[PDB]
Amino acid sequence: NSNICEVCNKWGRLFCCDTCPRSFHEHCHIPSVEANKNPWSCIFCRIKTIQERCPESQSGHQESEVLMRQMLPEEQLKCEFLLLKVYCDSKSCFFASEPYYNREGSQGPQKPMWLNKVKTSLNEQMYTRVEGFVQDMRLIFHNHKEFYREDKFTRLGIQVQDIFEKNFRNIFAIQETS
Ligand SMILES: [Zn+2]
Ligand SMILES: [Zn+2]
Ligand SMILES: [Zn+2]
Known part of the structure:
Protein backbone atom coordinates (compact mmCIF):
# COMPACT_ATOMS: atom_id res chain seq x y z
CA ASN A 1 0.00 0.00 0.00
CA SER A 2 0.92 3.68 -0.50
CA ASN A 3 2.34 5.46 2.59
CA ILE A 4 0.35 8.69 2.04
CA CYS A 5 -3.45 9.45 2.05
CA GLU A 6 -4.80 9.32 -1.47
CA VAL A 7 -6.98 12.39 -0.78
CA CYS A 8 -4.74 14.92 1.12
CA ASN A 9 -1.32 13.41 0.30
CA LYS A 10 -0.11 13.40 3.93
CA TRP A 11 1.07 10.56 6.12
CA GLY A 12 -0.55 9.70 9.38
CA ARG A 13 -3.01 7.09 10.74
CA LEU A 14 -3.80 5.39 7.37
CA PHE A 15 -6.28 2.61 6.56
CA CYS A 16 -5.16 0.51 3.66
CA CYS A 17 -7.39 -0.85 0.88
CA ASP A 18 -7.31 -4.67 0.48
CA THR A 19 -7.96 -4.74 -3.24
CA CYS A 20 -5.81 -1.86 -4.34
CA PRO A 21 -2.67 -0.07 -3.07
CA ARG A 22 -4.41 3.12 -1.96
CA SER A 23 -4.48 4.36 1.62
CA PHE A 24 -6.74 6.84 3.50
CA HIS A 25 -7.14 8.88 6.55
CA GLU A 26 -10.37 7.82 8.30
CA HIS A 27 -12.34 11.05 7.49
CA CYS A 28 -10.60 11.63 4.16
CA HIS A 29 -12.30 8.54 2.68
CA ILE A 30 -15.97 9.01 1.86
CA PRO A 31 -17.85 7.37 3.36
CA SER A 32 -15.53 7.50 6.57
CA VAL A 33 -13.48 4.26 6.70
CA GLU A 34 -15.74 1.53 8.07
CA ALA A 35 -14.97 0.23 11.69
CA ASN A 36 -14.49 -3.45 11.00
CA LYS A 37 -14.86 -5.16 7.56
CA ASN A 38 -11.95 -7.46 6.69
CA PRO A 39 -11.22 -7.34 3.87
CA TRP A 40 -12.04 -3.64 3.19
CA SER A 41 -12.31 -2.20 -0.28
CA CYS A 42 -11.97 1.64 -0.89
CA ILE A 43 -14.50 3.70 -2.89
CA PHE A 44 -12.25 3.52 -5.94
CA CYS A 45 -12.50 -0.23 -5.84
CA ARG A 46 -16.30 -0.18 -5.23
CA ILE A 47 -16.82 2.10 -8.24
CA LYS A 48 -14.68 -0.11 -10.49
CA THR A 49 -16.82 -3.12 -9.40
CA ILE A 50 -20.07 -1.39 -10.50
CA GLN A 51 -18.56 -0.78 -13.89
CA GLU A 52 -17.29 -4.36 -14.18
CA ARG A 53 -20.65 -5.83 -13.22
CA CYS A 54 -22.49 -3.65 -15.79
CA PRO A 55 -20.15 -2.76 -18.68
CA GLU A 56 -22.97 -0.98 -20.46
CA SER A 57 -23.09 1.54 -17.60
CA GLN A 58 -20.16 3.25 -19.40
CA SER A 59 -22.21 4.05 -22.49
ZN1 LIG B 1 -6.00 12.43 4.20
ZN1 LIG C 1 -9.07 0.22 -3.32
ZN1 LIG D 1 -25.12 -6.12 -16.93
Whole structure:
Protein backbone atom coordinates (compact mmCIF):
# COMPACT_ATOMS: atom_id res chain seq x y z
CA ASN A 1 0.00 0.00 0.00
CA SER A 2 0.92 3.68 -0.50
CA ASN A 3 2.34 5.46 2.59
CA ILE A 4 0.35 8.69 2.04
CA CYS A 5 -3.45 9.45 2.05
CA GLU A 6 -4.80 9.32 -1.47
CA VAL A 7 -6.98 12.39 -0.78
CA CYS A 8 -4.74 14.92 1.12
CA ASN A 9 -1.32 13.41 0.30
CA LYS A 10 -0.11 13.40 3.93
CA TRP A 11 1.07 10.56 6.12
CA GLY A 12 -0.55 9.70 9.38
CA ARG A 13 -3.01 7.09 10.74
CA LEU A 14 -3.80 5.39 7.37
CA PHE A 15 -6.28 2.61 6.56
CA CYS A 16 -5.16 0.51 3.66
CA CYS A 17 -7.39 -0.85 0.88
CA ASP A 18 -7.31 -4.67 0.48
CA THR A 19 -7.96 -4.74 -3.24
CA CYS A 20 -5.81 -1.86 -4.34
CA PRO A 21 -2.67 -0.07 -3.07
CA ARG A 22 -4.41 3.12 -1.96
CA SER A 23 -4.48 4.36 1.62
CA PHE A 24 -6.74 6.84 3.50
CA HIS A 25 -7.14 8.88 6.55
CA GLU A 26 -10.37 7.82 8.30
CA HIS A 27 -12.34 11.05 7.49
CA CYS A 28 -10.60 11.63 4.16
CA HIS A 29 -12.30 8.54 2.68
CA ILE A 30 -15.97 9.01 1.86
CA PRO A 31 -17.85 7.37 3.36
CA SER A 32 -15.53 7.50 6.57
CA VAL A 33 -13.48 4.26 6.70
CA GLU A 34 -15.74 1.53 8.07
CA ALA A 35 -14.97 0.23 11.69
CA ASN A 36 -14.49 -3.45 11.00
CA LYS A 37 -14.86 -5.16 7.56
CA ASN A 38 -11.95 -7.46 6.69
CA PRO A 39 -11.22 -7.34 3.87
CA TRP A 40 -12.04 -3.64 3.19
CA SER A 41 -12.31 -2.20 -0.28
CA CYS A 42 -11.97 1.64 -0.89
CA ILE A 43 -14.50 3.70 -2.89
CA PHE A 44 -12.25 3.52 -5.94
CA CYS A 45 -12.50 -0.23 -5.84
CA ARG A 46 -16.30 -0.18 -5.23
CA ILE A 47 -16.82 2.10 -8.24
CA LYS A 48 -14.68 -0.11 -10.49
CA THR A 49 -16.82 -3.12 -9.40
CA ILE A 50 -20.07 -1.39 -10.50
CA GLN A 51 -18.56 -0.78 -13.89
CA GLU A 52 -17.29 -4.36 -14.18
CA ARG A 53 -20.65 -5.83 -13.22
CA CYS A 54 -22.49 -3.65 -15.79
CA PRO A 55 -20.15 -2.76 -18.68
CA GLU A 56 -22.97 -0.98 -20.46
CA SER A 57 -23.09 1.54 -17.60
CA GLN A 58 -20.16 3.25 -19.40
CA SER A 59 -22.21 4.05 -22.49
CA GLY A 60 -23.01 7.77 -22.85
CA HIS A 61 -25.87 9.29 -20.91
CA GLN A 62 -27.72 12.57 -21.00
CA GLU A 63 -27.10 14.84 -18.00
CA SER A 64 -30.84 15.50 -17.67
CA GLU A 65 -31.52 11.81 -17.19
CA VAL A 66 -28.66 11.39 -14.70
CA LEU A 67 -29.86 14.32 -12.57
CA MET A 68 -33.35 12.83 -12.25
CA ARG A 69 -32.14 9.54 -10.91
CA GLN A 70 -33.17 8.64 -7.41
CA MET A 71 -30.43 8.24 -4.83
CA LEU A 72 -30.40 4.46 -4.68
CA PRO A 73 -27.18 2.83 -3.30
CA GLU A 74 -25.20 2.96 -6.56
CA GLU A 75 -26.01 6.65 -7.16
CA GLN A 76 -25.25 7.45 -3.49
CA LEU A 77 -21.86 5.87 -3.98
CA LYS A 78 -21.18 7.67 -7.23
CA CYS A 79 -21.94 11.04 -5.54
CA GLU A 80 -19.69 10.14 -2.61
CA PHE A 81 -16.88 9.34 -5.04
CA LEU A 82 -17.42 12.57 -7.01
CA LEU A 83 -17.30 14.57 -3.73
CA LEU A 84 -14.07 12.75 -2.80
CA LYS A 85 -12.52 13.58 -6.21
CA VAL A 86 -13.08 17.28 -5.40
CA TYR A 87 -11.38 16.95 -2.01
CA CYS A 88 -8.48 15.27 -3.79
CA ASP A 89 -7.55 18.68 -5.21
CA SER A 90 -5.67 20.84 -2.80
CA LYS A 91 -7.63 23.89 -3.92
CA SER A 92 -10.70 22.33 -2.22
CA CYS A 93 -9.50 23.83 1.00
CA PHE A 94 -11.04 27.13 0.04
CA PHE A 95 -14.48 25.54 -0.29
CA ALA A 96 -14.37 22.97 2.56
CA SER A 97 -15.52 24.84 5.62
CA GLU A 98 -18.27 27.36 6.27
CA PRO A 99 -17.55 30.69 4.53
CA TYR A 100 -18.19 34.25 5.68
CA TYR A 101 -18.70 37.35 3.60
CA ASN A 102 -17.41 40.88 4.44
CA ARG A 103 -15.92 42.58 1.41
CA GLU A 104 -16.43 46.18 0.39
CA GLY A 105 -18.70 46.32 -2.67
CA SER A 106 -20.09 42.79 -2.40
CA GLN A 107 -22.93 41.16 -0.58
CA GLY A 108 -22.82 37.48 0.58
CA PRO A 109 -24.88 34.82 -1.13
CA GLN A 110 -28.46 34.11 -0.19
CA LYS A 111 -27.71 30.42 0.22
CA PRO A 112 -24.16 29.70 1.40
CA MET A 113 -22.78 26.25 0.64
CA TRP A 114 -19.58 24.40 1.30
CA LEU A 115 -18.05 20.91 0.86
CA ASN A 116 -18.33 19.74 4.45
CA LYS A 117 -22.06 20.67 4.36
CA VAL A 118 -22.51 18.52 1.21
CA LYS A 119 -20.56 15.77 2.94
CA THR A 120 -22.87 15.84 5.99
CA SER A 121 -25.91 15.94 3.72
CA LEU A 122 -24.77 12.80 1.91
CA ASN A 123 -23.98 11.02 5.15
CA GLU A 124 -27.46 11.95 6.51
CA GLN A 125 -29.21 10.70 3.24
CA MET A 126 -30.69 14.20 2.68
CA TYR A 127 -30.62 14.02 -1.11
CA THR A 128 -33.40 12.03 -2.83
CA ARG A 129 -32.11 12.61 -6.40
CA VAL A 130 -28.67 13.13 -7.99
CA GLU A 131 -29.93 16.60 -8.94
CA GLY A 132 -29.89 17.73 -5.23
CA PHE A 133 -26.25 16.88 -4.81
CA VAL A 134 -25.19 18.39 -8.12
CA GLN A 135 -27.11 21.59 -7.52
CA ASP A 136 -25.43 22.12 -4.08
CA MET A 137 -22.00 21.39 -5.60
CA ARG A 138 -22.50 23.87 -8.46
CA LEU A 139 -23.83 26.42 -5.98
CA ILE A 140 -20.51 26.43 -4.12
CA PHE A 141 -18.70 27.71 -7.20
CA HIS A 142 -21.45 30.01 -8.42
CA ASN A 143 -21.58 31.79 -4.96
CA HIS A 144 -17.80 32.22 -5.12
CA LYS A 145 -17.82 33.77 -8.59
CA GLU A 146 -20.56 36.17 -7.78
CA PHE A 147 -19.07 37.33 -4.47
CA TYR A 148 -15.46 37.83 -5.66
CA ARG A 149 -16.50 39.73 -8.80
CA GLU A 150 -13.40 41.00 -10.56
CA ASP A 151 -10.95 39.91 -7.90
CA LYS A 152 -8.54 37.38 -9.43
CA PHE A 153 -9.50 35.03 -6.56
CA THR A 154 -12.61 34.26 -8.60
CA ARG A 155 -10.39 31.90 -10.59
CA LEU A 156 -10.17 29.42 -7.75
CA GLY A 157 -13.94 28.78 -8.20
CA ILE A 158 -13.45 28.17 -11.95
CA GLN A 159 -10.61 25.82 -11.28
CA VAL A 160 -12.33 23.66 -8.69
CA GLN A 161 -15.59 23.65 -10.70
CA ASP A 162 -13.64 22.31 -13.65
CA ILE A 163 -12.41 19.41 -11.49
CA PHE A 164 -16.00 18.77 -10.39
CA GLU A 165 -17.42 18.88 -13.92
CA LYS A 166 -14.71 16.60 -15.52
CA ASN A 167 -15.24 14.07 -12.76
CA PHE A 168 -19.05 14.31 -13.03
CA ARG A 169 -18.81 13.51 -16.76
CA ASN A 170 -16.46 10.57 -16.06
CA ILE A 171 -18.25 8.99 -13.12
CA PHE A 172 -21.77 9.28 -14.54
CA ALA A 173 -20.62 8.44 -18.12
CA ILE A 174 -22.03 11.59 -19.65
CA GLN A 175 -22.11 11.40 -23.50
CA GLU A 176 -19.12 13.17 -24.94
CA THR A 177 -19.85 16.30 -27.03
CA SER A 178 -18.02 19.11 -28.95
ZN1 LIG B 1 -6.00 12.43 4.20
ZN1 LIG C 1 -9.07 0.22 -3.32
ZN1 LIG D 1 -25.12 -6.12 -16.93
